[PDB]
């Protein structure tokens, strides 16, 4: 049953930086984190001001 489960693929949605299946994502993690957290930080700075 569960061995027949095949996960769909989402390359229409993914980031183009992590379209590389082999190269592991312990490296470009802080890039995505700092990108989104910088956006939320700019948001919170504007709302606080």
């Amino acid at each position: 049953s569960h061995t027949d489960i095949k996960v769909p693929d989402f390359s229409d949605y993914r980031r183009p930086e992590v379209l590389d299946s082999t190269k592991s994502s312990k490296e470009s993690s802080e890039a995505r984190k700092g990108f989104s957290y910088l956006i939320t930080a700019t948001t919170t700075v504007g709302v606080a001001y």
Binding site: V7, F10, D12, Y13, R14, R15, P16, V18, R32, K33
Partner: protein
């Protein structure tokens, strides 16, 4: 109606979800979502707006008939 835990007895369902950091914020905004919103506009406005062109004909027609009736000096 209440909180979680009891609501409906459902089997036979799988849901695949993705962490949002793998995915972009706006995938194909100006090439797929624009035909989507153009189709959603194109469906309904030919049903919703024709009451408003009745409103605009009442606007113009009643306005000009009123000015003709009240400017007979």
């Amino acid at each position: 109606g209440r909180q979680f835990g009891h609501l409906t007895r459902v089997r036979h369902v799988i849901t695949y979800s993705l962490s949002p950091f793998e995915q972009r914020a706006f995938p194909h905004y100006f090439s797929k979502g624009i035909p989507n919103v153009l189709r959603r506009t194109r469906a309904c406005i030919l049903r919703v707006a024709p009451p408003f062109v009745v409103f605009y004909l009442v606007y113009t027609w009643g306005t000009q008939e009123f000015e003709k009736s009240k400017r007979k000096n």
